[PDB]
């Protein structure tokens, strides 16, 4: 286990949020075991196969809830060992490592545009729209849909304790896309005035609940409420194979320093602890399509995404064991 | 209108929010005409009916949507009225305006007592307890649940924007009692866990509809999904008379500076607009009671605390015009 | 019995439906009682007491669910019998008559316009308001928020089988409010697009249920689906006194001809029944208010406009027995 | 492009509506290319796919919302432009026209016919039946329900604007099968009778939502209130492949005229719009099953019928183009 | 403290069950003050005073969650104690305990069959009817509706663990009632059958839940999901006072022999607990009316019910103290 | 037909439930299919043909609902029926009836096994866990819960009328599980308290409606209310395959003795029906996962169950016709 720099900077970057979102994370960890292959000073694949092995658990054990992730490193070690266990040379494997990592980055920007393309037909001229965080395949939909000529209008929860909203505000904004930025206890004063929720996934389950950012849940009850069509803007590789086996996927707890700052924290009473769940689930009952890169489901058919692509790795270990 | 300076930096403080909550708010105002009459230089009695009338106004102006504002100086100036127009000397009348503005200020102390007496006989030992902002009436109930003996933990809401939950949190924190810190955001998150909600009101209608902080009617809703009280701790001056005859409760809308601060807002594109609603709507079948000085009700019989204190003033104007 | 013939020609409109919509209704059957006693070649008091007793079983056979029209009888012949019961000459009589049926008719008509004044407080600047049938008291609302200067477009349901609708779009339409008129069936279709529901009633009962036109039950239910406000537009005199000793209403059924024409319908298979309910019941779960004269009530306080105006007359019989 | 006259002729009988119900307008459409390739003057090959090719945009135009018309044409010119493509003699194409719209208009005759078997078998001895407009597939599992010997009354609502509902009685009255006759507003008074609603579909989208005659979705949302089964009748044809993609069905306004009379509408004021649509869509929630040739199945695997039979089409442009 | 044997016998019974049902048991308390001030040995009045307030504690002691219990020696006791403290002889204070007595036992039977009455009003010809326990109240109300004439049929419940539908059963039956006999579980598979609830109450609270034998909540909420209408038959008296002032009523847990037999429940492990509430609450949104004696009213007018008749007593300390 | 003994003694085994639990009735068909072919006394192949065929029949017609047993004989017969067809000697198809049958016997031991450690993973450590009746795959998973370690506590219900829920209560008390037993009434009051339900079934439909023990629905039901999970764990032997082309399962009702015992039976009015359904319907809305061998599913997915394992069987008659 020699393993480069860029691989250790990724992780250390995805850990402190400095890359985030669940579709980019998956990138930078297909990036880092790519530039481990490239600048690898190894002999033997033997030598090589341990390599990636050590990068892709160190990559694996940053951030546990975006399955994007795992998937990314699922999708280029799947097939190294096949190449490995077959038998290949040094530079045949240093290939399929850095030819994985290149289809699995592009294949994630062709998901995300394609997702644009089928999201924003299901948006109408003159729509609001209210989304949560900063999700790349949601905001996706919503250039798209101004792009079309439509003339939306996008509420923007602020997305608490890290300001993601801010970061959303700024990019639509940008595109000539008009916001309206709120508080995140506001989304239920202003879901009669929205026409459609678009919002993004870490995780989808085996039964269509949708892992993603601390809020999203209400956002879809209230919506549910009144009957404003929640959408969640979602990659194939953010579905959850192991949930196929019952597995709950753990929901991250952040550092209570995020909420309430250091300087400010350190004053405060024993008696008061700060929570900090990065994200919530949302059940498929309040969901009404995921928009994907192969098309429109009900959040129900999530089981069937999981079925066709990754089903077959789970009687198998995993590779990088 | 030779006004004191107290009435004007009262005005501003409520304005401000350096004075805040709308029990409090009332009892501000109420003290802000007591001082008036003790401090006025006047000689007639029509000209001191003429300087409460303007020191009315001004603090009437002041914020729109607590009712409990515009109830203390009614109730204040309901009695200077009709000693007036009956005829009385310029002491007599400094008088019933200082005295009826003492009777209200105690009034007020002793219905957010008497609210955590009756209130707590609901919160049962080992409860969890959600609550939003900083409502001296919700705390009062859980003072007592404590001092009772009850093992409470209670989950405060940070309440965005204005960071009311920091407010609360210290304030339980230090009676003993152990607070779990959240923002808003993950109020369905921990919905599951939480056994009772109690929050507090600035306005209460005609149909039991009831006006408070922003986010309130977020965790109403959820409370009501999971079938957890929610439990509305509220003296009988936050109920609003005009609502009986079909006045819609004005939503205050405050700078935008307090969500996005200036030196940071300033640099925004123009087409981002931040929208701050001081306050929401809960609509009365997801609340459980309303905890008042008079008793439990359910929020429907809302109409009958106004029909029987406050009906009377209706047929009548306002007793400052 | 020497019965007027204005009398029989009011009922013969009433049953016919020449004379309709609840208010009216009542306030023509008043009418026929104050020409009886004008036109009455009676020479005893008792000879005029057994005219009016018979006037108002004529009257009263008419059509059963419109509670108006039974309180408009009651409040005549309460008062009448009272005088009777005392001992009061022919002509004492006879004005009590005239005299306590101008006062109703009066009242009605005060009643309908305070209604509006109150309900359209609840109508906002650029509201789309969908309504059903023709109701005077609704209609007051809605003229009254034009008046107002609000922005307002109304969606007229038309209201089968006998076209009410075409009633009201002609009414607002000329007094330049915009009109959408709509069959029944797309009343969830445009849902989405009201921002308040405003109905009529013709019984209200003791619990909150509310008797109105047919196809009124399914528009409430679509408007609490989304989360728009149902508001009940009625007088006193619509809610419904036997309602409180368990006494359900009586739903007409109406000649089914009104729904086929006689031309058609009779050429048809007889193993074909047509039904023609005028009415339908809507639960208080469904209302938001109800608009009276008296005030802005949650549809669960029917039972105390009941308990203070009517209550007292069930312990009685009927005054015209 | 010398198209015969039948293609014109069943063009503006399916948009004036003298042909209707989307099974039969698809077999009337797959009827129109039929009798093309029959009566074609052509020489080449070349020209017969272009006059095939003009009858079906001709055809394809009428009336958007029924996509079994569309599915009509795609199954005889997937066919013939592979043909064509291929290389095929003017009396194999004109062939491949006229049986591919052979097997079409078998295989809906087959599917209605198999629907009404299965359907019925979830139809008990007793049963009420409420539905809406005028479906075949509908009709044919009454029709089997009634065959098999089960004693079932139907509710027939009349199904405005155009009255489809008169069709609808008269056709079950005359199989024996007694019916009760209500207008549309009186579907909640009566779903409380109504044990199992059967209605048809002209649209189904990949997550389950039912387009279909406008009233439809009142229906299944007051069923789904007192817990009646809403099933849907409906051939595969009337799966909606576009909406994979993230299209939405466009609803068809129909000329003003249909509600109001001609010689009525002109005579109204400027200030009152009439609005028609001919349909609304309706939730998968409130729908328990639907019934196809293939079998039963909850609403959400309508994205499963759509898989394995239309999407290899969707990579692919129109076979028409 | 003299206590007769009667008082002991009431009290042991009361607690055994083998006097049971929340009307019966108030009258048996009554009944047991009565017997004491009758054959009291006493010499003074200051004497007899302590006697009935021991014999009070003893009786109220027996069994915490009927409040008709606590409500009848009240109605005894109230009038008592104002009788001793403005002072009165031995034989008048014994009358006034015997008469109170008197008063209350006869009031009970009136309320009783004068809730029938107003309840089978509200009871159709042909209603099948589902119960649970054996309610007197209830029972009222069936057997007014059977003597009208209608065709009933009751489904009864058979309410484990202490069997009281076997009562139920056998009490309707032998009044020529048809029962349908089911075990509790079988409660929503028979809700679409039944069109009317009709069940008691031990306690009614300020906002409206109803307290009740255990199973109540269940089938009211299945009620609730099939839009049957669920009625509460109910005395005054068995509203619940201190619920007012935010007490929570104390649901009894009775022996565990009462479900599983001590023979058996002797050779069970150590680590089953048997738990055997006698009662649950019922929320108000699941009840459609309480009948009473004063009439039908929605479950939020309990609060009303509270404070025209027993509000006066609760600055009081208890009239047996 | 020379059908062995052992035949005949597990089908009245079957139908007094000496043998019940849908899973162990299936292999009890299947044992008893296997010692037909072992004992059989018979010279040709075509003689053991009818023979097997006689004993399918024999224990299809003991008990209608559990769809498992039909599957069992199905997996045996279909077998032995392709073999005779194809043309095979006497020990050849004895042979492939008794290895038919012990592949399924083990099979099904596998399924529950391997539910049980796929269900366990969504019990996390400190659960309450609510279940109904004796399901041996249910049990499975909160054994496998409590052998990782997790620290749960199951609430029994008692499952009137033939007590299973003592055979549960003793089954989990000795493997160290701490239960809670409560009658069936008392599940909506214990809902609060309950973080999961796991519960059986007896056949699973197209729609994904689960049949179960009488007074799983109501659980589910209340479960819904609450939020609670609500878990189905089952076979793929357990869905339902003639439930794809539209038939209705249907509901055993057993004899009314089971509720009310023969000796008190007897002496009850005529007048009094006791009703017995083994079974209720609890929809697919109210289920959160169904737990299989292949997975977790939500209950839409069951037509994909169906579809690839037992749709082919369906275009075939019976295999034992
Ligand atoms: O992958 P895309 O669509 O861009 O974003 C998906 C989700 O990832 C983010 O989480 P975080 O910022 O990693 O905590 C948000 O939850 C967002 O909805
Ligand atoms: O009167 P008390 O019970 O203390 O507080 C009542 C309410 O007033 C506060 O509003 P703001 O801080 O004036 O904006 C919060 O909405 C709080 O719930
Ligand atoms: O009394 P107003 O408010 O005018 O009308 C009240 C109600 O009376 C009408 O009934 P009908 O036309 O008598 O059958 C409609 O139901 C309308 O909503
Ligand atoms: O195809 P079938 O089952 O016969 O009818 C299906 C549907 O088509 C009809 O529409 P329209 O009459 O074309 O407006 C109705 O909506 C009906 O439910
Ligand atoms: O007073 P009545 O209407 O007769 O019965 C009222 C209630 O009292 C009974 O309780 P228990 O048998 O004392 O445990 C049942 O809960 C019944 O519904
Ligand atoms: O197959 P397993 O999981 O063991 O049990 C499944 C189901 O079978 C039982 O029915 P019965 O006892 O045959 O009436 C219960 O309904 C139980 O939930």
Chains 1, 2, 3, 4, 5, 6 share one sequence.
Not at 57 to 67: D, E, F, G, M, W
Not at 134 to 152: P, T, W, Y
Request: proline share 5%; glycine share 4%.
């Amino acid at each position: 286990a020699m393993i480069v720099k860029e691989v250790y900077e990724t992780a250390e970057k995805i850990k402190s949020m400095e890359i985030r979102g669940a579709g980019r994370i998956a990138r930078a960890a297909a990036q880092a075991l790519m530039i481990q292959a490239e600048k690898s000073k190894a002999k033997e694949p033997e030598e090589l196969w341990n390599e990636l092995k050590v990068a892709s658990k160190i990559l694996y054990n940053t951030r546990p809830t975006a399955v994007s992730l795992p998937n990314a490193l699922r999708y280029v070690m799947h097939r190294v060992k096949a190449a490995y266990l077959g038998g290949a040379d040094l530079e045949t494997l240093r290939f399929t490592a850095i030819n994985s990592a290149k289809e699995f980055i592009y294949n994630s920007e062709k998901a995300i545009e394609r997702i644009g393309e089928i999201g924003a037909k299901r948006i109408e001229d003159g729509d609001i729209i209210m989304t949560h965080c900063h999700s790349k395949a949601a905001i996706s939909v919503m250039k798209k849909a101004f792009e079309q000529g439509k003339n939306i209008k996008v509420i923007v929860t602020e997305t608490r304790p890290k300001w993601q909203g801010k970061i959303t505000a700024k990019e639509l904004a940008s595109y000539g896309i008009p916001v309206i930025y709120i508080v995140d206890s506001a989304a239920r004063h202003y879901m009669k005035m929205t026409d459609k929720v678009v919002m993004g996934a870490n995780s989808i389950t085996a039964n269509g609940a949708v892992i993603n950012k601390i809020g999203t849940s209400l956002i879809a009850l209230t919506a549910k409420e009144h009957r404003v069509w929640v959408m969640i803007a979602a990659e194939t590789y953010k579905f959850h194979p192991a949930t196929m086996l019952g597995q709950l996927v753990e929901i991250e707890m952040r550092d209570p320093t995020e909420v309430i700052p250091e300087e400010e924290l350190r004053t405060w009473p024993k008696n008061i602890e700060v929570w900090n769940p990065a994200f919530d689930v949302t059940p498929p009952e309040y969901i009404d399509v995921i928009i994907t890169e192969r098309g429109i489901i009900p959040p129900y058919a999530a089981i069937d995404i999981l079925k066709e692509e990754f089903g077959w790795a789970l009687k198998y270990k995993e590779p990088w064991e």
